[PDB]
Amino acid sequence: ESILEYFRPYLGRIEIMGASRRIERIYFEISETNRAQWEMPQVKESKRQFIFDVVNEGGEAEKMELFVSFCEDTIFEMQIAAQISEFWGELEVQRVKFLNYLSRNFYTLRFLALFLAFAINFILLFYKVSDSPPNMVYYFLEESTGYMEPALWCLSLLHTLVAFLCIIGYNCLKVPLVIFKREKELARKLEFDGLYITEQPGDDDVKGQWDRLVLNTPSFPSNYWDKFVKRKVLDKHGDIFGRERIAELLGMDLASLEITAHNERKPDPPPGLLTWLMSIDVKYQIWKFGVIFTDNSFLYLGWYMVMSLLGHYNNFFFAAHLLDIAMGVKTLRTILSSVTHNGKQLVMTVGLLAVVVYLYTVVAFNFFRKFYNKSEDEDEPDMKCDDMMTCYLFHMYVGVRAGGGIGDEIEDPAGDEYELYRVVFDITFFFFVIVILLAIIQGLIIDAFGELRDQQEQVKEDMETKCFICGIGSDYFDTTPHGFETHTLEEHNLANYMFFLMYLINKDETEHTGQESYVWKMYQERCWDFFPAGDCFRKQYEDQLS
Amino acid sequence: VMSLLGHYNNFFFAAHLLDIAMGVKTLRTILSSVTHNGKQLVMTVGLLAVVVYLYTVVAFNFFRKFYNKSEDEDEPDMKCDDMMTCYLFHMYVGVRAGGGIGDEIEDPAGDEYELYRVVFDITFFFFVIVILLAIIQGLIIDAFGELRDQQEQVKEDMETKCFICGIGSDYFDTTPHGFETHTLEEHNLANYMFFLMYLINKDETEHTGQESYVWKMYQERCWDFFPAGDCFRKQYEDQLS
Ligand SMILES: CCCCCCCC/C=C\CCCCCCCC(=O)O[C@@H](COC(=O)CCCCCCCCCCCCCCC)COP(=O)([O-])OCC[N+](C)(C)C
Ligand SMILES: CCCCCCCC/C=C\CCCCCCCC(=O)O[C@@H](COC(=O)CCCCCCCCCCCCCCC)COP(=O)([O-])OCC[N+](C)(C)C
Ligand SMILES: Nc1ncnc2c1ncn2[C@@H]1O[C@H](COP(=O)(O)OP(=O)(O)OP(=O)(O)O)[C@@H](O)[C@H]1O
Ligand SMILES: Nc1ncnc2c1ncn2[C@@H]1O[C@H](COP(=O)(O)OP(=O)(O)OP(=O)(O)O)[C@@H](O)[C@H]1O
Ligand SMILES: Cn1c(=O)c2c(ncn2C)n(C)c1=O
Ligand SMILES: [Ca+2]
Ligand SMILES: [Ca+2]
Ligand SMILES: [Zn+2]
Ligand SMILES: [Zn+2]
Numbered sequence: 001e002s003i004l005e006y007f008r009p010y011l012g013r014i015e016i017m018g019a020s021r022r023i024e025r026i027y028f029e030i031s032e033t034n035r036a037q038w039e040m041p042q043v044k045e046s047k048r049q050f051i052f053d054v055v056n057e058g059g060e061a062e063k064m065e066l067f068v069s070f071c072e073d074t075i076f077e078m079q080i081a082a083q084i085s086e087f088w089g090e091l092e093v094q095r096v097k098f099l100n101y102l103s104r105n106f107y108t109l110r111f112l113a114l115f116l117a118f119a120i121n122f123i124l125l126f127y128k129v130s131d132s133p134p135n136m137v138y139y140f141l142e143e144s145t146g147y148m149e150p151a152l153w154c155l156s157l158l159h160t161l162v163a164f165l166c167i168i169g170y171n172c173l174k175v176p177l178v179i180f181k182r183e184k185e186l187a188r189k190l191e192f193d194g195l196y197i198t199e200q201p202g203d204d205d206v207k208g209q210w211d212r213l214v215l216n217t218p219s220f221p222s223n224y225w226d227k228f229v230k231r232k233v234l235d236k237h238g239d240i241f242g243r244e245r246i247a248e249l250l251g252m253d254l255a256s257l258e259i260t261a262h263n264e265r266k267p268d269p270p271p272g273l274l275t276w277l278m279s280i281d282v283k284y285q286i287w288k289f290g291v292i293f294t295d296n297s298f299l300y301l302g303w304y305m306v307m308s309l310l311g312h313y314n315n316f317f318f319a320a321h322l323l324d325i326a327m328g329v330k331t332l333r334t335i336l337s338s339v340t341h342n343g344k345q346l347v348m349t350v351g352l353l354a355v356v357v358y359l360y361t362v363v364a365f366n367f368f369r370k371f372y373n374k375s376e377d378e379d380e381p382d383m384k385c386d387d388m389m390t391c392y393l394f395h396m397y398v399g400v401r402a403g404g405g406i407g408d409e410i411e412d413p414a415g416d417e418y419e420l421y422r423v424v425f426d427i428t429f430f431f432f433v434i435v436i437l438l439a440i441i442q443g444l445i446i447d448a449f450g451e452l453r454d455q456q457e458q459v460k461e462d463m464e465t466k467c468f469i470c471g472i473g474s475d476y477f478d479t480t481p482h483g484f485e486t487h488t489l490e491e492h493n494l495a496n497y498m499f500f501l502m503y504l505i506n507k508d509e510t511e512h513t514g515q516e517s518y519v520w521k522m523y524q525e526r527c528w529d530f531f532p533a534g535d536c537f538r539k540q541y542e543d544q545l546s
Numbered sequence: 547v548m549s550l551l552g553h554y555n556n557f558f559f560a561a562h563l564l565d566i567a568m569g570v571k572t573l574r575t576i577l578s579s580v581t582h583n584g585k586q587l588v589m590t591v592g593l594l595a596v597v598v599y600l601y602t603v604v605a606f607n608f609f610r611k612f613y614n615k616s617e618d619e620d621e622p623d624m625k626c627d628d629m630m631t632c633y634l635f636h637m638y639v640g641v642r643a644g645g646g647i648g649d650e651i652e653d654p655a656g657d658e659y660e661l662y663r664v665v666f667d668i669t670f671f672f673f674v675i676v677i678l679l680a681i682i683q684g685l686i687i688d689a690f691g692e693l694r695d696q697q698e699q700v701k702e703d704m705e706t707k708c709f710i711c712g713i714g715s716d717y718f719d720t721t722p723h724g725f726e727t728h729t730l731e732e733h734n735l736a737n738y739m740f741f742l743m744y745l746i747n748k749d750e751t752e753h754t755g756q757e758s759y760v761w762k763m764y765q766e767r768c769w770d771f772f773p774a775g776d777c778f779r780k781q782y783e784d785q786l787s
Contacts, residue, residue: 401645
């Protein structure tokens with residue numbers, strides 16, 4: 001019993017479909033470092049996001065196809081977590097240590113940046129403008145507190161430095177995952193689908209046309225686990241598309257690959273800076289800059305950098321950093337996600353408002369223009385509807401904002417032949433614009449709140465009622481007490497399937513057993529038939545009592 | 547404390563009127579709707595403060611001429627000479643006044659910054675007056691729906707599944723009034739409650755085999771005696787119980 005208790009965390013168990021028609025149970029070893037890396041909060045958050053998006057967007061037919069991909073991505077991330085874990089050579093080692101320090105404390109730098117922005121704004125809360133020095137006016141900090149201006153200067157410098165550290169850290173730990181995902185997707189597309197061989201991408205596909213740059217670059221499979229994708233594509237499509245055309249498209253040399261296949265040399269790489277710069281692939285760097293610039297978080301951080309530099313140029317610009325609270329706190333993100341859920345419908349609704357108010361201006365310029373005199377003095381009238389530019393601007397700026405429509409601002413229509421017509425005009429403008437459209441605006445936000453809440457509830461219920469791997473309902477396992485918990489924690493646990501991949505990858509091919517070799521060979525062929533979908537061990541041997 | 551202060555000054559007793567909220571049950575339910583999303587509400591007012599502060603920042607640097615609230619020409623009263631007064635004015639007047647801050651601010655017609663001020667007023671009207679108050683109302687409405695859905699779910703779960711064994715009502719519904727008989731005689735909650743006292747009171751030497759077995763398992767914090775997933779009727783369905 002003591003040995004089993006000691007080795008319980010390291011004993012992983014999974015279930016596979018099997019070479020035969022019977023579900024088979026597989027036992028293997030889980031490394032301590034693998035479990036330590038898996039339990040990291042970042043990995044936990046990534047797994048939560050993956051589960052949420054998979055459940056919400058469905059994709060049942062591709063479920064396993066997504067899951068395996070997730071595992072691959074996650075593995076790369078924790079490799080980075082292993083790498084960034086806690087004359088020329090001296091500066092290089094200082095640079096790598098500094099980069100690692102920035103990578104480790106990125107979130108702390110974000111928190112410090114938010115706090116520094118709050119402090120800078122609180123200091124700026126004491127500005128005052130006066131004509132006399134402390135013809136145009138001057139600005140100065142009017143306060144009785146000492147050394148406030150030097151403190152503000154130091155806070156500005158520290159804020160910019162910390163934000164720059166944020167930029168460098170984010171480039172250190174987040175970009176390689178995006179690059180790896182893009183390389184993986186492009187490799188799958190050009191190896192199986194052949195989107196560039198005997199097929200072309202669509203013109204509207206911006207990313208499809210952008211991915212054409214790294215086709216012939218020597219560093220194409222960089223930042224990705226596989227480095228022989230181009231050779232496999234050549235072997236797959238040379239006999240049809242033409243070996244020479246494939247070589248030119250992928251930038252390969254048949255003689256070079258042949259001689260390296262026979263035997264390769266081991267030249268010494270020069271550590272010089274000039275030769276290193278010469279060895280930099282310009283096209284690959286251009287493609288990497290293009291893909292990284294399309295990211296949202298990187299653009300947000302670049303905007304934060306620009307705001308910091310403008311803050312050095314003019315201190316008041318730092319006020320913009322207050323909006324980072326929306327990106328900072330999670331409840332901020334949720335409540336503003338309600339607004340962003342129906343954003344297209346919202347810009348929609350304001351456009352419809354503009355059109356209907358334009359029609360009201362059209363019918364107000366042709367007949368009811370006399371009633372638009374906003375000048376009290378009789379000597380100099382001020383007609384706001386002499387031309388439709390002023391009339392439409394007046395209706396847009398005054399009629400929409402003023403409660404009760406445009407009739408309140410417009411003169412009294414009593415005592416005129418068009419009094420009934422003007423009454424209909426004002427009442428219909430009040431109902432159609434002030435009431436209905438703003439009601440739509442509020443209803444969109446309320447519906448978005450309900451939508452997000454329903455999505456979260458559906459995800460929770462789906463997770464709590466059905467198993468992720470086999471899909472069998474919780475009731476059948478609930479026949480036996482705590483059956484569902486045992487099934488979801490021991491038999492078909494997600495972490496066990498994740499760990500089995502690494503256990504296959506680390507150990508040598510000659511050490512794989514029959515089951516391990518079978519799973520590995522079917523994995524290579526992108527075949528997901530080993531997952532026990534629709535069946536499990538318990539019902540396989542229900543008569544035999546397992 | 548309120549009562550003692552009421553003795554000190556009688557008017558303090560007015561505070562006790564708020565006890566109606568704690569007193570009547572419907573009071574508690576309707577205010578539970580408000581308290582359901584309280585963090586989201588203090589949230590939303592904080593975001594309001596930040597966005598109005600940004601509007602004051604862009605109103606202190608350029609559009610400060612239009613903040614003269616004094617009718618007399620001899621003694622002007624600028625409300626945006628410093629950002630303390632400008633921010634207080636926007637917080638206290640702009641938010642409360644329907645239509646944004648443009649109504650209180652002077653007429654921008656006839657100036658080079660008239661279009662810029664039009665954008666300023668219209669965007670302050672939409673972003674502050676419309677969107678944020680819409681969020682405030684939507685949170686309360688969503689909380690009402692949340693509590694109602696919770697009560698409905700609890701009622702349905704109680705009325706459809708048995709609490710002890712968890713078997714659905716349909717299987718018992720095969721026999722007429724089967725679910726009622728099962729939930730009133732076989733797996734009644736009160737019977738399980740009473741059995742614990744019946745075991746605690748009687749002496750240990752008087753316990754039978756079944757009573758002694760349940761008692762020992764209870765003492766070891768083991769809950770395997772509860773018939774979860776099985777019951778008498780399906781145990782002897784072939785034998786007709
Ligand atoms: C987005 C909503 C838009 C509609 C808002 C409706 C609110 C107001 C509704 C009604 C008040 C109508 C005006 C007062 C009556 C005047 C009579 C008249 O038009 O005869 C004219 C002749 O005929 C024409 O020139 C064309 C006749 C139709 C004009 C447009 C009517 C729009 C109806 C829309 C249907 C809406 C139904 C109900 C909607 C709730 C006389 O014109 P005049 O004096 O000889 O010349 C004038 C100068 N002019 C040459 C420049 C033209
Ligand atoms: C929460 C919402 C916040 C934003 C509300 C926006 C409403 C209003 C929008 C627009 C009206 C803008 C003002 C009128 C035009 C003036 C030109 C100008 O700025 O040039 C200036 C030079 O340049 C600078 O000093 C910096 C330029 C940018 C200033 C800040 C713009 C904010 C944009 C936000 C993006 C919003 C996009 C749309 C949002 C719906 C000229 O300045 P000056 O006269 O030489 O010196 C003045 C005194 N000073 C030294 C103290 C500075
Ligand atoms: N094959 C499966 N593997 C794991 N969990 C499963 C599987 N199928 C269903 N589940 C669900 O997983 C739930 C348990 O979640 P789990 O223990 O994985 O949470 P977690 O990721 O540790 O949580 P947290 O969000 O706190 O980090 C069960 O309630 C069950 O409904
Ligand atoms: N094991 C169980 N024991 C008792 N009731 C159960 C059980 N499982 C489910 N129920 C549900 O409880 C309901 C009966 O509730 P009950 O008769 O206890 O109401 P009550 O609590 O006496 O009424 P009140 O709330 O007014 O006191 C049944 O409709 C049944 O669906
Ligand atoms: C098959 N395979 C993988 O699936 C893999 C990997 N590194 C990460 N992953 C996910 N390597 C090196 C690999 O050969
Ligand atoms: Ca072997
Ligand atoms: Ca006895
Ligand atoms: Zn399962
Ligand atoms: Zn029962």
